[PDB]
Write a structure and sequence with these properties.
It is classed as virus. This is part of a larger assembly, with 4 copies of chain A and 2 copies of chain B. Chain A is mainly beta. In chain A, 7% of the residues lie in helices and 35% in strands. In chain B, the strands form 2 sheets. A 5-stranded antiparallel β-sheet of chain B has the order 4-3-2-7-8, with no helix packed on it. Chain B is built from no helices and 8 strands. The chains are: A mainly beta, B mainly beta.
Chain lengths: 504, 130, 168, 168, 168, 130
């Protein structure tokens, strides 16, 4: 069952991080009119499992590699058009295709990746797109510009529900020590130096950033739950090099700093690697653990870091001035002894309103989790990892309990008025006036419940409004309240559909 | 990383409007959350209005609403302070200062007015009235 | 044939802040058990045998519950402001802003929970700072509170590593 | 498995409470380069159970006794340099060695005493040290100054966790 | 059981018969202080069977080869420093290492080669040495100078007699 | 156990600084937590600043901050009161008094200013202004 086809145009001299153009599955199934396109009309909406097959010639003397980044949503489409850094295109579920190998084909399950079956007539959420980039480039120029065809073989049977399985159900201990799609920017060894030391930071969960704008990815937030991590990481190296580049390198873990002379260094446990193949290294800590995040007055090398030394240098034949890239990917952590989780089942602060400048004020929340936009009062939000899992994932569902906390600026004996919350079905133009509470501000605490979702079952981050329950906070006399807070714990039933990164 | 050049301040009659010069981009982004600042003799660094530009969220200072505005031109894509009407006491030189390390807690919130957060500081333009 | 133990499973007083001389005041505890060093208010500590087992032993670990107790110097009808506690992971330069509580001082009692430890698992007496949860008490209007106390009971899971003496 | 060696210098007329000098295991395993020192590099951090063996001649006519005080931490190191009272050196886990007997050797478990396995490259917490003092001295002077060798026999296998069993 | 380590520095354009430097096992076991070095003190004199493991990257486009000549005695050390002809370095027990292959490791029995177990404190007969030379060189120049590490894995148990089996 | 000898008090102009003599050690320790004390005619023994020296913790009296200081020289290792500026009313003779029975509840706490705790009492030095 072949449906959809596309081409990508690769210039003669590809560069590292250069943009090779994108293509979307909506265009390929619509443009390439076929059996499956019109079988996708009668079926309504489908949840396809289909294998992309990229057809390129196998040639081992240029040492190219390309990263295919699959974003269901257009977060990074605007970022990536010029000088696409590794972090933007490696923070989304991605597959590396190696030029030495040929006809790379690896399936994708659109149920486990994106979670929501898709419509035909138009697009409700932005189309699932694929971005290609040279992760590292050829040493020297090619003969002339070339091309690659990308095909996707699918079978279309009807989808029963708009929602697949939830990717993860949120709980306080959520980190089991297993990773998906964790890879790093290319480490580069230069040829001139007789020896070389390179260092990879081992403290995951530090929200990798280019230098100006941070990037939230799910692996970082998933590590940020625990306080430090265990030992014995296992990952494999991929040597992106021509056939005539060669290097052999020794891999150890270091805290805090490198022994200068080598006859002290070879005593440590470490792995030699001269080819593309796995290593397994155990994390060396004075405390047997590594914090996994950094404090205010601290650097990144002071903690544990895993180091690559070149004991026998990268050798070169007569003509190459180009550097040799090494890329590592961590499949798993093994023999885990994880420390205490950061946050227990107690509540976490969600939003806090303060500096009310105009009285008889309302604030509208609705079914959405964030994006309140209160124009007569200042608002603040939490850094917590849960609100990070809301920004990383595409669709989120559930119900979350509330509390209110406030204090009084005026004298307690001059107090008056109330803080109410109003709960409707649909927006107040029409509505059924469900359970609403009027708390007098003399009480100073209140607790209620809120639903995030729709009739469809889940609500995404970029805003639309679909019929659901609508909650608004109304303040009778505002100036009284100096500061207001609301902290929320999600009920056990919760879900996150889709996987993505949020470039902020 | 960031260059800044500004002019457009000078004496004016009450009820007057002084446009402030478009903030000079530097190093090919000019997208960072940036807030103006004021002074008073003996009193340093009180904040003024700001915009979170990419979300189109406006923030104004206390003690002022409507007589200072801050907007971004869609075509020029460069922030500039706008002042449509003016009270006698604008004594200070205004400052333009931007912060580029925005995270997730500074994004959906209102733009902060604290002085300690903004790492890029520049001279700014002199404004006063008789 | 041993007689009755001195202290039952009821709480024991841990630290008490008083004589606030400067308003809008904070106090930082952190993950450490002692060594608060509040410079704008006077502090006092307990003689109890548990805080003695903390000084004798080298490393101590666990989690201990809290309560707050305070009273008002001003008139109750002139009262204003709050006493909050702020709970982070790491020091406030960076942090995740975990569960924090704002109690109005009109309530007069509050209860929370604290962890003493690290990622490594235990925190000793002579100070260093290793990545862990960080708790600070912040007072909006300080002069109101005449005396503040906090009394803590450790949860059953607790431990003491090492053996030593403390010459004071 | 012999690793580490040290000497202590005893003056001819020992006094009651006089200080006979200290020695630390970090220095003895680093200085005496051997099988176990470099086996302690590859193992990372170790939790050794090792027996100190102090070799002194057995002589029953002077009635000496020496107390060996083992402090993992440097609390008493500053106190004890001059006129070391009994309470400072008897409030730490200590072993009495009797001059009538000879070649006193009693093991120590660094797991049950100090609880935390130790690093090599440098010291995170101050080194485990040993202080020796005459607890009571000879009736009359000796013939001339003398000496004693202290040895510690160890076996080093890797430690799984930074924490042993909790002492209590 | 790793003991001893060394490096050799190979210039960018190796020549046929050029001298690539030597290294002696006495220096590597003394300089690299370890488990086996000090296990070689207590054992007295040892007759080790140990495998040299030379670690170099496998690259098939330069067609290099190096000859490792092992001389227990310093007969050829003076001859070979300049323009080392093939016969000098191929008349001693020698092993060819091919650059196409990688991580060449072939054992040596110091009992069958040299026949006499060796002392530690000093050298009675001149130290067993290893000389490396390019037997034939690259067609064209490399990119830049490079390096190779040589390791020798040994196990040391005591030698009963000063003499092994007679070779013939 | 403890000897004390002091001088250095006398009349001075306003804004003046009188250093007080280093507390005489006695019996080879001089490490005890020690607090100064003041009087007023009709009003006895109000406390003044103190130091817990070994932890480097400072304590100051109410009604005074910054114009009385108390510090320990690292080399001399002997406490002495320091007064950098002075208000008119210092009427009393100051007293130096130390307590050497410190426990664990007086160690991590702020140094106490209560008069009843300190068992070593001495005459002290006369200070006044016109």
């Amino acid at each position: 069952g072949l449906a959809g086809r596309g081409v990508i145009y690769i210039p003669k001299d590809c560069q590292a991080n250069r943009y090779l153009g994108t293509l979307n599955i909506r265009d390929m199934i619509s443009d390439f009119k076929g059996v499956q396109y019109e079988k996708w009309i009668t079926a309504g909406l489908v949840m396809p499992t289909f294998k992309i097959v990229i057809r390129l010639p196998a040639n081992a003397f240029t040492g190219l590699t390309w990263v295919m980044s699959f974003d269901a949503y257009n977060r990074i489409t605007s970022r990536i058009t010029a000088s696409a850094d590794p972090v933007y295109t490696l923070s989304v579920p991605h597959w590396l295709i190696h030029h030495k190998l040929g006809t790379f084909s690896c399936e994708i399950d659109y149920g486990e990746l994106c979670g929501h079956a898709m419509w035909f007539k138009s697009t409700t959420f932005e189309s699932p797109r694929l971005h290609f980039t040279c992760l590292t480039g050829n040493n020297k120029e090619l003969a002339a510009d070339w091309q690659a065809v990308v095909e996707l073989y699918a079978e279309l049977e009807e989808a029963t529900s708009f929602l697949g399985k939830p990717t993860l159900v949120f709980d306080p201990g959520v980190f089991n020590g297993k990773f998906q799609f964790l890879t790093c920017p290319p480490i580069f060894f230069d040829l001139t130096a007789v020896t070389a030391l390179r260092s990879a930071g081992l403290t995951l969960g530090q929200v990798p950033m280019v230098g100006t704008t941070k990037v939230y990815n799910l692996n970082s937030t998933l590590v940020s739950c625990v306080l430090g991590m265990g030992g014995t990481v296992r990952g494999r190296v991929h040597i992106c090099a021509p056939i005539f580049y060669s290097i052999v390198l020794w891999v150890v873990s270091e805290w805090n700093g490198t022994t200068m002379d080598w006859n002290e260094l070879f005593k440590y446990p470490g792995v030699y690697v001269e080819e593309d193949g796995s290593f397994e290294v155990k994390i060396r800590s004075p405390y047997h653990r590594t914090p996994a995040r950094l404090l205010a007055g601290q650097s990144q090398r002071d903690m544990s870091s895993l180091n690559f030394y070149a004991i026998a240098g990268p050798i070169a034949p007569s003509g190459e001035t180009a550097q040799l890239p090494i890329v590592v990917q961590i499949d798993e952590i093994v023999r885990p002894d994880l420390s205490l989780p950061s946050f227990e089942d107690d509540y976490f602060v969600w939003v806090d309103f303060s500096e009310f400048t105009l009285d008889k004020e309302e604030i509208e929340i609705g079914s959405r989790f964030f994006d309140f936009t209160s124009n007569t009062c200042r608002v603040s939000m939490g850094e917590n990892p849960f609100a990070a899992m809301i920004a990383c994932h595409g669709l989120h569902s559930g119900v979350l309990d509330l509390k209110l906390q406030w204090s009084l600026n005026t004298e307690f004996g001059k107090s008056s008025g109330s803080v109410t919350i109003t709960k409707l079905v649909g927006d107040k133009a029409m509505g059924l006036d469900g359970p609403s509470h009027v708390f007098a501000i003399q009480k100073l605490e209140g607790t209620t419940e809120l639903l995030v979702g729709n009739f469809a079952g889940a609500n995404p981050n970029t805003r639309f409004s679909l019929y659901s329950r609508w909650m608004a906070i109304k303040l009778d006399q505002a100036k009284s309240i100096k500061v207001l807070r609301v902290l929320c714990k999600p009920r056990p039933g919760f879900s996150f559909y889709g996987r993505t990164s949020f470039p902020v | 990383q960031v260059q800044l050049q500004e002019s457009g301040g000078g004496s004016v009659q009450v009820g007057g409007s002084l446009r402030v010069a478009c903030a000079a981009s530097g190093d090919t982004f000019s997208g960072y959350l940036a807030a103006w600042f004021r002074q008073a003799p003996g009193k340093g660094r009180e904040g003024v209005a700001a915009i979170n530009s990419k979300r189109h969220t406006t923030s104004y200072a206390d003690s002022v609403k409507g007589r200072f505005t801050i907007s971004k031109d869609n075509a020029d894509n460069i922030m500039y302070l706008e002042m449509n009407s003016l009270k006698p006491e604008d004594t200070a030189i205004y400052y333009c200062a931007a912060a580029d390390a925005i995270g997730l807690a500074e994004y959906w919130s209102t733009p902060t007015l604290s002085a300690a957060r903004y790492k890029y500081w520049g001279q700014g333009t002199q404004v006063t009235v008789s």
